[PDB]
Paper text:
LutR, initially named YvfI,27 belongs to the GntR family, which is one of the largest families of bacterial transcriptional regulators. It consists of 240 amino-acid residues and forms two distinct domains: a 78 residue long N-terminal DBD and a 162-residue C-terminal EBD. Specifically, it acts as a repressor of the lutABC operon, which codes for three iron–sulfur proteins essential for l-lactate utilization, as well as the lutP gene, encoding l-lactate permease.
The crystal belonged to the P222 space group and contained 30.8% of solvent. The asymmetric unit comprised one protein molecule, all residues of which were modeled into a well-defined electron density map, with the exception of the first six N-terminal residues representing a cloning artifact and the first native residue of the LutR–DBD. The non-protein electron density map was explained by 81 water molecules and two sodium ions. The LutR–DBD structure consists of one of the most abundant DNA-binding motifs, winged helix–turn–helix (wHTH), structurally homologous to transcriptional regulators of the MarR family. The topology of the LutR–DBD starts with an unstructured N-terminus followed by three α-helices: α1 (residues 10–25), α2 (residues 36–43) and α3 (residues 53–61), which are connected by loops. The expected β-strands folded into the wing were not revealed in our DNA-free structure. However, it is highly plausible that they are formed upon DNA binding, and their positions were predicted by the servers, AlphaFold 235 and JPred436 for amino acid regions 63–66 and 69–73. The crystal structure revealed a LutR–DBD monomer. However, the formation of a dimer both in the presence and absence of DNA was confirmed by size exclusion chromatography (SEC) (ESI†).
Author numbering: 3 to 78
Amino acid sequence: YKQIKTKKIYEEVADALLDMIKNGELKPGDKLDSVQALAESFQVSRSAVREALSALKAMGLVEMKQGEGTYLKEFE
Ligand code: NA
Ligand code: NA
């Protein structure tokens, strides 16, 4: 029961972001914090955050509005 999955660091970060989506902290259409801000908040490298955001992008959860920021997808 307490045989918890072990994960790579970027996967811990991706899961924390998914959690925030589920709990309504990060809402569809919201601009995500910068890589630097997320790295500091999660106590990980910029590299880990970028890999986590690539994972979310591959899940179709992320987009760009023209440019200058990463946004949670609002409309599928
Ligand atoms: Na592993
Ligand atoms: Na973490």
